[PDB]
Amino acid sequence: DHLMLARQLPLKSVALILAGGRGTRLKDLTNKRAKPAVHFGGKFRIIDFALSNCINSGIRRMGVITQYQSHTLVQHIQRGWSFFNEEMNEFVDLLPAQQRMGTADAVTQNLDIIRRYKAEYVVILAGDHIYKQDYSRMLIDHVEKGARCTVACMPVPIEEASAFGVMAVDENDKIIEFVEKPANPPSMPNDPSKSLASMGIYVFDADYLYELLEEDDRDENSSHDFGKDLIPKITEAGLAYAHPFPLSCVQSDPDAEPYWRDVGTLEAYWKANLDLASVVPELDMYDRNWPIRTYNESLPPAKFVQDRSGSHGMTLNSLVSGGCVISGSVVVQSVLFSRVRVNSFCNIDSAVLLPEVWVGRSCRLRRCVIDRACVIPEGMVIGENAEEDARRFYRSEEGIVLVTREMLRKLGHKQER
Amino acid sequence: LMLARQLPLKSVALILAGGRGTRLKDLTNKRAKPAVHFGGKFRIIDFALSNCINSGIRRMGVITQYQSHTLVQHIQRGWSFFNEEMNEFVDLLPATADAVTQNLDIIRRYKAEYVVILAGDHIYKQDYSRMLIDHVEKGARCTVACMPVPIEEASAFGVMAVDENDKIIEFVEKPANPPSMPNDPSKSLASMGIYVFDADYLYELLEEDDRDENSSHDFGKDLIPKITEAGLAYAHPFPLSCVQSDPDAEPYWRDVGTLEAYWKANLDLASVVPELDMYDRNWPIRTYNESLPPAKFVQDRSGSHGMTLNSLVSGGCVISGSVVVQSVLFSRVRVNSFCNIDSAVLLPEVWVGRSCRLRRCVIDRACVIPEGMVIGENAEEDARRFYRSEEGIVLVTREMLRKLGHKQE
Amino acid sequence: RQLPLKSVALILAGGRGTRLKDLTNKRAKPAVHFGGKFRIIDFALSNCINSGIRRMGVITQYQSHTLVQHIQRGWSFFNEEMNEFVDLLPAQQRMKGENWYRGTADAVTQNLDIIRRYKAEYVVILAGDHIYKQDYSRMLIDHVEKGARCTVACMPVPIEEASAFGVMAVDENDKIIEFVEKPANPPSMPNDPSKSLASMGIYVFDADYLYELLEEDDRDENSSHDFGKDLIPKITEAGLAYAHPFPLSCVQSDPDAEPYWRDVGTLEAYWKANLDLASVVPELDMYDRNWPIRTYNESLPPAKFVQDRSGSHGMTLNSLVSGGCVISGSVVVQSVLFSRVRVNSFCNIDSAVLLPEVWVGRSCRLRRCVIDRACVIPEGMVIGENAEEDARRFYRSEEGIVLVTREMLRKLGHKQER
Amino acid sequence: RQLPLKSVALILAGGRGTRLKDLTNKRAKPAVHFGGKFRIIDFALSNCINSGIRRMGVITQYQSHTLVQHIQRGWSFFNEEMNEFVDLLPAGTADAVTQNLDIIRRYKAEYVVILAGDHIYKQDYSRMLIDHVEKGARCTVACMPVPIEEASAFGVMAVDDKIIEFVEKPANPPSMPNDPSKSLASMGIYVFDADYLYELLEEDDRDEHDFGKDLIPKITEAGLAYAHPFPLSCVQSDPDAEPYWRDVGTLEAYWKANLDLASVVPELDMYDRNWPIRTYNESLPPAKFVQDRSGSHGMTLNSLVSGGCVISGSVVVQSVLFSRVRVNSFCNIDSAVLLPEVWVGRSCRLRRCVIDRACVIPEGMVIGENAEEDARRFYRSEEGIVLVTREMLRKLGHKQER
């Protein structure tokens, strides 16, 4: 009755989505947004993936914990994720938390409300990552292994493993050693090029988690963080187990590598968006069997019109969302979000244009990210002069330019934000 | 303006959505005409419904008799967002005047003071609240929206002649020899199939019509002449309530009766300055919004780019290079490499094989065009394989292609 | 989990309910009011939701306006992009003869093109005119484990009532050996002569197998195109049909109790099933938060109890009073009052079912009756005390249960204008 | 009609409701239960819907979870593509609006309607909008005569229908010139020209912050403020009656307003289909009345019994029972307000009291008969109204879990 254990498991589970992430490494992109509220994929926000994974996994009871610049995130939840009939034991609960002087503390603050859920299993999720996963499969593995805490894990390049918690496991996926964000990451025994990293995705026995949080709240030596404090304590007790991500990762092509993006840097964010514009994207957004939902506005179809000279337009490996109006121009390796306006004689290459961007005539944009509702003045060139770009806007080490409404205003260009 | 707001609140809109739309040929064989796709992501009935919402009339009765499911499903998915305790609803009333008479018990329980009769198979923007005001101020029992139409096309409408101040003196339904307006012999004053009724008066009229005698049970053929003869019918000029961004332009209203007119009306939205404004936030048209992916443009098999000239590309589409000119592509349309698409309307889920050329045509839903097919260049070959109109517009359907040998599985 | 996800529920909601007399004159039986605030179809639909089956096709035929409107109001909250929906599937009355009506299977066959596009692996066939709680996910598991092509939910019923159902006989392996539809002399169970093993009209099908079966049945000129009369015997003869004991999946708080299932076939049974909820210990538990029954919820005011005209109290004994009701004193005993029921002063209401919006005039006495929706009872009327007078004015069942409708009251000269 | 379409309603729902004592412990005042199945904020929200204003911004600041949850479950049915929404805007009263000025500007509204979310009343805001435009005012303030002995709690004004003088919460309230027994009071309901309000808030933010204490006097001095008599827009079935408006400030007033709905002719009409009040509607079972342990019937006199309730015989008089309230056998309940999920043990007597949500009253407890004993165990107001809370009962040794 693995199908019975399957169904009965999400029904006794509650998902807690940590959506307080500041996303500091994203620079001005998160100055007035929480990282889970960051735009992605032309019409989505990052938090939509964790929420959609819960729905598709059979977990219809969700608690979204927020802490940093929460308005746009709350509004998004209100407009796209408030379709539930709570009498049927399904809901998306907004659980605000206050900054106190870690991730476990935000859950501890809302512990009274979470206890009233009367859940047997608690699924802890990071709401600022992009991935597809069937949490019901992880729940089964958690129960079959008899674990008190199950941590989703995945091999990552060792040069990037210092940003994660790194672990070493048993013959029966039991965690033996755990270190949080090591400067010198231990490598996997079968492969020195990779480290076994924690994905920030946990399954907990509910009663055990409550006791653990109560003890952690009373501990004066703790930073009240899941990775830095709780997971090592559970590992030392021998009650923590690991869950290989390929067991539950949802992907159309089974021969491909498991998709998971933390979207930590501006370059990684720019890279992840343009992946969807490529011929064969690593992330499949056309899968009807694991759909990602979001707030769907009644935008008009993407409109392509002749330029002022009556000439046509060209498009190469690009995404154009609804409500856009493009006058001829050249759009290459770019992702245009909703209601983006591109005027005549423009050249847009390897660019990410967030919703409501207005691009003036005769502009050239290369290897850049244009923030929401930016009004680009006629003739502006971006991505061709490294020194001039760094003066006017933010320019990353890799050469990716970020443009913001405040930046354009300081330059004297009028803008309606 | 106080009269304005309190007027739609005491009003109920009845939308006749049983239209067969036979003049659209195979396009309406498996759909009712109000369920016909339009504008890349809409159905025709969305305009009448949106006009009601934007006019303050939130109580609607949609009468459906023909090709019900796809229309009913559309209402379910996109027009079932109401809280009926707040006196707002869209009521599915399975069953022109007879269709209203059949549901007279349910309609009476609405307890409406005014009844707005609408045709659900026309494309237009109108503020019904303005027509309601004109109906009350004129003291009329029945008010008929009217508009001048070319006299050579007036035989398809109910033609009227008005008194000094917009009364109804003479009315004839679909005359073979249409009377010309006295102020202009070039155009006849035509009825738009849009009526405002005093509710109690309409109920009595329908009761009488049911009991006698040899009537066609039709609004235009039977009811309107009877009201005109009684002297209780008045006319409402459409420009008084027509909603349009440019006030200097002509009033927009399309009955979408023939394949050519349907093909023409869709491509208007792809032009630089469309006659129909679908970007007006002050009079929005709502519909069922799926979570389609952004329109995707990819290089063709040869790594070459694609070209687009005055075209609409809906969500979920994937276009590999190719040339798209003066065309409207509906949802989930797949266009493969080396294609040339010109002045074409491609309904949802159309799959266009490689190296195809489509010109001046309408491709029906989910058609699988085989590799290399050419349409719109050989008149005799087009007429053999598919339907070809007198004006040269080609309609392609999955059954036509199946009889042609290439399967659509 | 993966089992309900690959399933689609088809709810047959075209039931005439002729044995309910005027109660189904202007509505289909699945649209019949029940429990003070519900309609009968709400149970099958809620069972689907609670079982994890969020893809539903409601097949409607007879008097469907109020049923469709109910679906529109209370069961149109789905995000279809997430593979969840309640689909309205109208079906037309077709006849295989001069007086030969096509049956339940034909209604599904008519919508076979739409149902195929669901791309379901399993099809759950449900009757939308019965009142019960069942976890279909458990039945799906039993269907797969038994390797069956068709699984039929079954339950022992009193043999004197078994002529209304299909009656079966099974293996120790649980395969159906014999099946007879609506026998006038129902075969008794081997372990018990007082009971017959009855079919509950609830089936689980392998989707591809069902499609083939319906295609063949559509081309068969000797078939009445009915699940019970035609398909089930054919599957039984082929040896591909198995039985599912209802207690395996029946949802009930008290495990020591008997499985609850009511077909609500007659006026007396309908009256009886409603009053059960008013008793001290109802057989049907409507207070279970773990298997809730949802319906169209209107923002009714709380039930209002006011003094009568003489300023006296009101008295209530084992009764249900729904929202929007206003009761002026009076005595209400063993009764169920639906939404917006108005009971005026000096009334005595005993063992009565009052459907929504009923207006009871002053000094009325109602006993052992069912009052249809929006009836306006005139001042001083007495019902349920004079058998012959009751039968003259209204409908009176063999057991003495009276049914009152607005049309009956109008023929008597009592205005119903509201 | 075109006036509400260019309008956006901002509902101030941060009220702490201090004068309600433990009733607002762990609750915002707009989230306080009322009418058996409603919360106080439902009236302002329903008024907006029925007035044609379908764009609403709810500003919340104090103990906001239960209020936010209520908005999520009962007021999240909007299709925002059609320019209709209820937005949660976490944040003096003017500062809360100023903090969210960026989001509010993006609404692109022409008129802003400012509402207090902790009052109970029925009003057609569209009529006030018309009066605002016809008078050519920049700010319109809804006003109503109140008894002068209670006028110190309101902003008091005088008018020529243009503002003249204003004073926020005066200890010595000026009486109306035509009648010394009353004072013309502000109802905390304003209509603003949107662009003008934004400029005013910008200036106020830079001035080294309550609508009544700061902004309204400044607008009055400028001569740009006008008054709107409440009877012009108040919605009421009986036109001969007095305009209904309750601030529900004290425990006694809260207890009084609830019991009004239980009377034979309530001052507040909740049966008007033309101006309905919506709320979160759970699929509760019908109110259940069963025989008591002795097989005896139950008695009810002028009382409201909400869904999910189960009453075992007992006598319920002049009381309002909220959802899922259990009353066991042999109980006597008189002039009492029982909030949701209250469990009343057998043989209890409750009189002139308010029982907070989910209280578990132990068998035999008597409340409302001994003043000194009531004041020792619970809170007792000056008028003799008793408030019972789960914490109070647990301090006395009576277990509440459940």
Ligand SMILES: O=P(O)(O)OC[C@H]1O[C@](O)(COP(=O)(O)O)[C@@H](O)[C@@H]1O
């Ligand atoms: O009786 P029905 O078929 O349910 O319909 C309601 C009928 O009763 C009426 O109230 C008429 O009743 P009376 O004229 O006898 O008072 C109308 O609403 C309508 O004709």
